[PDB]
Amino acid sequence: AKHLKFIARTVMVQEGNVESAYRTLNRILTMDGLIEDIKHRRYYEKPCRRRQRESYERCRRIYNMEMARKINFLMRKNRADPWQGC
Amino acid sequence: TKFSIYPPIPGEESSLRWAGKKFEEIPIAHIKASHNNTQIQVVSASNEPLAFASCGTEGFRNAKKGTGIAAQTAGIAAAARAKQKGVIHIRVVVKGLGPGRLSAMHGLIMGGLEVISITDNTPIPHXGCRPRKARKL
Amino acid sequence: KTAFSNVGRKISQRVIHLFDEKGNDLGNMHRANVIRLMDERDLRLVQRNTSTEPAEYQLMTGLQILQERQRLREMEKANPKTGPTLRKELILSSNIGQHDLDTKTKQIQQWIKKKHLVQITIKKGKNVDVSENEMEEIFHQILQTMPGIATFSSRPQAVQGGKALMCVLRALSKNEEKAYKETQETQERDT
Amino acid sequence: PRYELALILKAMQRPETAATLKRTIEALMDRGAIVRDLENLGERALPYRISAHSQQHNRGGYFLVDFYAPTAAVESMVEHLSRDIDVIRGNIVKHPLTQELKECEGIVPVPLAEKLYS
RNA sequence: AAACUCCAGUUGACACAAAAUAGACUACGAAAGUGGCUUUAACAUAUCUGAACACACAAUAGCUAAGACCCAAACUGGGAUUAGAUACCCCACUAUGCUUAGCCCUAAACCUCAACAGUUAAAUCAACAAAACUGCUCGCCAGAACACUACGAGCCACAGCUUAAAACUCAAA
Ligand SMILES: [K+]
Ligand SMILES: [K+]
Ligand SMILES: [Mg+2]
Ligand SMILES: [Mg+2]
Ligand SMILES: [Mg+2]
Ligand SMILES: [Mg+2]
Ligand SMILES: [Mg+2]
Ligand SMILES: [Mg+2]
Ligand SMILES: [Mg+2]
Ligand SMILES: [Mg+2]
Ligand SMILES: [Mg+2]
Ligand SMILES: [Mg+2]
Ligand SMILES: [Mg+2]
Ligand SMILES: [Mg+2]
Ligand SMILES: [Mg+2]
Ligand SMILES: [Mg+2]
Ligand SMILES: [Mg+2]
Ligand SMILES: [Mg+2]
Ligand SMILES: [Mg+2]
């Protein structure tokens, strides 16, 4: 309200391609967490519920990163069989 | 020169022009995309209103207002009244995640207006008023 | 609900009876010609009457549409007609307990004070066989609690082959209420 | 202790800006402060519009005053700055150069088991 | 549907309300709690253990008095749904959530892990939870239900809190 306008969350359109500009803006707002923030703010999430989801999200991210690391490590041996017939 | 998605900063010397007008002089299309309606107001750089259209003023009622085709129709209506007043290039400022968020912009284009930039001004309180309680569905 | 607002550019019918912003009758014309008028004069289209066989629409400005919409809401506030009569219904059993029948009787009373119609159905109970006249007694017990507040809209009638009776109760009309007060007063003078 | 006053002044001409600084440094001295230095950070556009004393501001003069004062002088100085109409925004912080930074060897790895366990 | 139509959109001015991102961090505090900024004061104990009641605290809700009031919101009112709907769904608005001064003293107040010290070798270990144990101390428990009840006593509590039985009943829980 007190800030300058047309700087925050502003994307310029190139060659009249408004679809690509809108996708870029939506990608920016998504990566910065504003889209999820807006949605969670439509109804009040109670503090005990916010902590539960934040705890669930943090444990799921760790579990997925740890499961990705394991598969990357165990995919080194996905090469062809060196001792076929034995 | 390479294309910059960052808008030109006022007071600096840019080479970009639209019909001989600088970015600071292009009129603004304000799109409020609500969950049950979409409102579009086109204003000049001096904040002079030029055109207003919403799904309700285009003859849509109740749940039909909260549709993309209703917002697209509202955009076409606002574009027509704005084009008569001399508007070609507009800066789009959309607030809200309603169904007419993108469709309202398409209608502005189909109505003869050229969008040079898109700005999101969806209100996000930094801590603000308590929203209504969750719904049991 | 039907709202007094701009119909828009897409008109439902093809042939449209049109009027002027000042009320001058422009006659019947095709919807394509009406849209051209709305743009040439910068006016909006409202629906004044739909009952007429030729659909009647009128051109109006946003200011006019507002004044009429304001006018109408000042009339309805002055004359708030209670349009809908709501038919509440209660399905009872012959062997219903007194505590349950007293609870449902208090509920029927509250519906009558709100000027609703109460359809009461009484069905034969489980493991219980009853004379159809005995089932009819419950109707007189329910209405006895409302001596001067309710009366049979439709008298008890056998339904489903006589398995279950039916009925409809209503609130007494103002004339019927003054008659009850009159009759009650005469008895007071006699006693 | 040693404090740092971050002072944003109303954009004024040189004579009125000097009168504001002198009047502000004398207020510190009147409250027992020992003023160490005065730094000009330059006039710039504010990061946002600031309303102060029934006026709207878009530019301001940024100044720093490094000084020593008793702990009781801070409360009284904050009150003085609130009444000076030529001050847009004034904040007194503990001087950052007093706090000594502790040495760091590096980023020790944290076991993932503790993350989910914690 | 009701509701509003001194309504809505842009722009400007604007709080005694609430504190995006950081925070994927795991810190501070006895616990309860604590996540905008600044400053002041400031986070007991050079052996441990040690209280339903002593001493001091203790979320939310609630009480008494005076204030603030954006938004949310029991109750209530209206709309709709329904066989009914004292609900779930929609709208409005109040107590209340805030401040100040007093109370009240409860929680699934829960890592559902008592404090301190020690061990990783024995048998690893009913099961699940959270690898299995030792020393030492305090608190507590002894079938279910009756019973977060009765009576007594204490309490700023008066439809309250704390402590807390018995009779009848069962062969389970
Ligand atoms: K914050
Ligand atoms: K727990
Ligand atoms: Mg019905
Ligand atoms: Mg001790
Ligand atoms: Mg204790
Ligand atoms: Mg004891
Ligand atoms: Mg206790
Ligand atoms: Mg408390
Ligand atoms: Mg309170
Ligand atoms: Mg409200
Ligand atoms: Mg109701
Ligand atoms: Mg209130
Ligand atoms: Mg506050
Ligand atoms: Mg807790
Ligand atoms: Mg202990
Ligand atoms: Mg027992
Ligand atoms: Mg209890
Ligand atoms: Mg008790
Ligand atoms: Mg007692």
Report the relative pairing of strands B38-43 and B49-54 from DSSP bridges: antiparallel
**Inter-chain residue contact A22 with B109, CB threshold 8 Å:** no
Question: Residue B42 burial (CB < 10 Å; 0-12/13-18/19+)?
Answer: buried
Q: Is B118 within 8 Å of A14 when comparing Cβ atoms?
A: no
Q: Extract the tokens encoding D50.
A: 């600031």
Q: Is C119 helix (H, G, I), strand (E, B) or coil?
A: strand
CA D35/CA D2 separation, integer angstroms: 10
Centroid of ligand 13 to alpha carbon of A1 (angstroms): 22
> CA nearest A6 in B: which residue?
B119
Q: How many CA atoms lie within 13 A of D44 on its CB side?
A: 10
* B5 interfaces chain A, CB cutoff of 8 Å: yes
Tokens 């917002």 -> residue: B71
DSSP string, chain D: -EEEEEEEEE---HHHHHHHHHHHHHHHHHTT-EEEEEEEEEEEEEEEEEE-SS-EEEEEEEEEEEEE--HHHHHHHHHHHHH-TTEEEEEEEE-TTTSPPPP--------HHHHHH-
> Measured in angstroms, how far is the CA atom of residue A46 from the centroid of ligand 8?
20
DSSP labels, B35-95: SS-EEEEEE-TT--EEEEEETTTTT--GGGGGSHHHHHHHHHHHHHHHHHTT--EEEEEEE
CA-based R_g, chain D, Å: 19
CA distance C37 to C18: 11
What is the torsion angle, in degrees rounded to the nearest 10, for the CA atoms of residue C99, residue C100, residue C102 and residue C107? 150
Measured distance CA(C141)–CA(C108) in Å, rounded = 12
Cα separation, A69 vs D65, in Å, equals 53
Are C57 and C18 within 8 A, CB to CB? yes
Write the Ramachandran bin of C8: left for phi over 0, alpha for psi from -120 to 50, otherwise beta: left
Is the C-beta of residue B124 closer than 7 Å to nucleic acid chain E? Answer: yes
Residue B104 to residues A29, B17, B92, B96: CA-CA distances in angstroms? Answer: 19, 25, 10, 12
For residue D87, list its beta bridge partners.
Answer: D9
Q: Give C119's contacts (C-beta < 8 A, 6+ positions apart).
A: C87, C88, C89, C90, C166, C167, C168
Nearest to D116 among A2, A4, A62 (CB): A62
By the 10 Å C-beta count (0-12 exposed, 13-18 middle, 19+ buried), C87 is classed as exposed
A 34-63 residues with CB < 8 A to B: 34-35, 37-39, 41-45
Which of C116, C118, C120, C119 is closest to C136 using CA atoms? C120
Using an 8 Å CB-CB cutoff, list chain C residues near B77: 9
Mutate one of B52, B61, B67, B84 to test the C interface: name it (highest C CB count within 10 A).
B61
- DSSP lists the bridge partners of residue B21 as B18
Distance from CA of A23 to the nearest CA of B (A): 10
Task: Quote the CA–CA distance of B69 and B78 in Å, as a whole number.
Answer: 14
Torsion of the alpha carbons at B103, B106, B112 and B118, rounded to the nearest 10:
100
Identify whether the C-beta of residue B85 lies closer than 8 Å to the C-beta of residue B50.
yes
Q: How much of chain B is helix, strand and coil, in % rounded to 5?
A: 25, 25, 50
Please state, as a whole number, how many other Cβ atoms lie within 10 Å of the Cβ of residue D118: 6
Distance, angstroms, CA A31 to C1' E10?
29
CA-based Rg of chain B, rounded to a whole angstrom? 16
Q: Which of C55, C116, B129, C83 is nearest to C108 (CA)?
A: C116
Give the sign of the dihedral formed by CA A45, CA A27, CA B38, CA C13: negative
Measure the CA–CA gap between D81 and D5, rounded to whole angstroms: 11
Report the candidate in C84, C89, C85, C21 with the shortest Cα–Cα distance to residue C57.
C21
B15 CA vs E165 C1’ separation (Å): 92
* Strand bridging mode C164-171 / C150-159: antiparallel
CATH class of D2-94: alpha beta
Range list of β-strands (E), chain A: 10-12
Task: Give the resolution value in Å.
Answer: 2.9
Question: Please, are residues A44 and B131 in contact by the beta-carbon 8 Å criterion?
Answer: yes
**Are D50 and A2 an interchain contact pair (Cβ–Cβ within 8 Å)?**
yes
Element (H, E) at C113: helix C98-113
Half-sphere exposure of C142 (CA within 13 A, CB side): 33
Helix (H, G, I), strand (E, B) or coil at C187: helix
Chain D residue with CA closest to A56: the answer is D116
Measured CA distances, B9 to A6, A12, B24, C22, C80 (Å): 9, 12, 9, 51, 59
Q: Which of residues 73-112 of B touch strand E (CB under 7 A)?
A: 93, 95
Q: Please say whether the dihedral angle defined by the alpha carbons of residues A37, A38, A43 and A44, taken in this order, is positive or negative.
A: positive
Distance, CA of B100 to chain centre: 10
Give the residue among D103, D92, D88 at the shortest CA–CA distance from D70: D92
How many Å lie between the alpha carbon of A20 and the closest alpha carbon of chain D?
30
User: Reduced to 3 states, what is the DSSP secondary structure of residue C167?
Assistant: strand
Q: What ligand has the least distance to the C-alpha of C110?
A: 11
For chain C, strand residue ranges (E) read 15-19, 25-30, 44-49, 56-60, 87-93, 117-123, 150-159, 164-171
Whether C25 contacts B78, CB under 8 Å: no
Contact D31, D73 (CB under 8 A): yes
- Token look-up 């000594």 returns D100
- SS3 (DSSP) at C188: helix
Which amino acid is residue C130, in one-letter code? Answer: V
Strands lying side by side in the sheet with C87-93: C87-93, C117-123, C164-171, C150-159
Q: Which long-range contacts (CB under 8 A, 24 or more apart) does A17-26 make?
A: A18/B105, A18/B106, A18/B109, A18/B115, A18/B118, A21/B5, A21/B115, A21/B117, A21/B118, A22/B102, A22/B105, A22/B118, A24/B5, A25/B118, A25/B120
DSSP assignment letter at B27: -
Question: For residue C146, which phi and psi values (nearest 5 degrees)?
Answer: -115, 70
